[PDB]
């Protein structure tokens with residue numbers, strides 16, 4: 171789904187520390203009964219992407235023809251207290267409205283930013299966005315004018331064991347955070363592509379690091395879910411005709 175890029179490598183998302191049950195908990199969010207079911211949808215698979223650059227040059231990655239975007243972070247420092255975040259910005263394109271997700275770094279030392287709220291949603295009608303100004307300015311003057319600015323908290327006490335996600339169609343947007351999902355009714359023409367800024371130089375809101383993995387989902391995926399005596403297992407169906415027959 172990603173454009174070719176020498177900075178981006180493939181990684182098994184489950185084998186990273188704290189990610190043993192990352193995909194398991196997402197699949198069983200809605201299946202609460204006992205027994206078996208085969209579910210289809212825009213679910214994440216095993217192999218994700220880690221994009222990083224040792225030099226402090228601004229770098230971008232592009233995902234095309236995707237319906238969903240998921241990402242995962244490492245555990246924050248001092249997660250139970252004054253948690254210090256790591257930065258990540260991406261932009262879901264559409265007309266006449268597009269969406270920018272920005273997660274800033276550092277802690278309570280960022281001026282004017284509400285306490286323990288590292289996440290920002292900018293709903294904007296701007297056609298061309300200057301990401302350098304967005305990620306280099308003071309937090310109070312970032313997403314202003316006619317844009318809609320929504321601060322939100324990641325859950326630092328989750329320690330990066332839960333998946334973060336976004337799915338969209340032309341009538342509804344769904345956000346996945348912690349073990350919960352939020353719905354947003356909006357009529358829009360999404361372009362089905364995402365721009366991601368994974369590295370730049372340190373600023374008042376950005377810290378040079380590589381702490382995220384991400385995946386864009388474009389194809390319909392099938393999982394077989396089995397709940398036996400409270401033991402929850404899953405299997406990725408390569409073809410639907412095999413696991414169901």
Ligand SMILES: *[C@@H]1O[C@H](CO[C@@H]2O[C@@H](C)[C@@H](O)[C@@H](O)[C@@H]2O)[C@@H](O[C@@H]2O[C@H](CO)[C@@H](O)[C@H](O)[C@H]2NC(C)=O)[C@H](O)[C@H]1NC(C)=O
Pocket residue numbers: 180181182217
């Ligand atoms: C992702 O992992 C696979 C397989 O990992 C194995 O199964 C996991 C559940 C866990 O137990 C791992 O420790 C296991 O190794 C990797 O594919 C393996 O690659 C090695 C080294 O080249 C090779 O000897 C094995 O035969 C491969 N196994 C299979 C089943 O093909 C794969 O490299 C990882 N993908 C990445 C890092 O992108």
Ligand SMILES: *[C@@H]1O[C@H](CO[C@@H]2O[C@@H](C)[C@@H](O)[C@@H](O)[C@@H]2O)[C@@H](O[C@@H]2O[C@H](CO)[C@@H](O)[C@H](O)[C@H]2NC(C)=O)[C@H](O)[C@H]1NC(C)=O
Pocket residue numbers: 248250251252253278285286
């Ligand atoms: C780890 O963070 C704790 C907790 O920070 C406090 O709570 C946060 C949610 C936020 O509101 C911070 O501003 C708070 O300070 C730190 O412990 C606090 O340290 C301050 C230092 O001025 C002190 O006044 C508080 O009493 C402490 N609160 C406690 C102990 O409950 C702690 O220092 C951090 N550890 C690091 C950064 O290593």
Ligand SMILES: *[C@@H]1O[C@H](CO)[C@@H](O[C@@H]2O[C@H](CO)[C@@H](O)[C@H](O)[C@H]2NC(C)=O)[C@H](O)[C@H]1NC(C)=O
Pocket residue numbers: 249250327328329
């Ligand atoms: C996230 O990690 C933190 C820090 O490792 C965990 O906080 C600890 O929780 C245990 C209970 O298992 C307490 O006894 C410790 O005192 C806590 N450590 C602190 C406050 O420094 C936290 O439980 C983890 N959250 C999860 C796993 O959801």
Ligand SMILES: *[C@@H]1O[C@H](CO)[C@@H](O[C@@H]2O[C@H](CO)[C@@H](O)[C@H](O)[C@H]2NC(C)=O)[C@H](O)[C@H]1NC(C)=O
Pocket residue numbers: 232234263361362363364365
């Ligand atoms: C995301 O997709 C949209 C829609 O396909 C792309 O917008 C088109 O881009 C081409 C090439 O620059 C232009 O010629 C078209 O006029 C655009 N169509 C529009 C705006 O409706 C957009 O470029 C894609 N973005 C990325 C980063 O791939």
Ligand SMILES: *[C@@H]1O[C@H](CO)[C@@H](O[C@@H]2O[C@H](CO)[C@@H](O)[C@H](O)[C@H]2NC(C)=O)[C@H](O)[C@H]1NC(C)=O
Pocket residue numbers: 186220221222223224244379380381382383
């Ligand atoms: C993504 O991969 C990079 C390397 O490509 C990882 O960062 C490296 O971490 C090791 C161990 O701390 C260091 O020796 C390297 O210098 C780091 N490289 C860079 C460019 O920072 C990074 O941890 C990976 N991200 C994950 C797993 O989330």
Ligand SMILES: *[C@@H]1O[C@H](CO)[C@@H](O[C@@H]2O[C@H](CO)[C@@H](O)[C@H](O)[C@H]2NC(C)=O)[C@H](O)[C@H]1NC(C)=O
Pocket residue numbers: 206396397398399403
């Ligand atoms: C769901 O998983 C459970 C546990 O792995 C499976 O139940 C086991 O099935 C095997 C062979 O069918 C039996 O030998 C075991 O005794 C069963 N375990 C228990 C605790 O009953 C079950 O078959 C799986 N479900 C499906 C539909 O494949």
Ligand SMILES: *[C@@H]1O[C@H](CO)[C@@H](O)[C@H](O)[C@H]1NC(C)=O
Pocket residue numbers: 388389
């Ligand atoms: C996604 O599905 C399309 C269906 O046309 C197929 O051509 C493509 O190879 C699939 N991609 C992956 C990564 O499975």
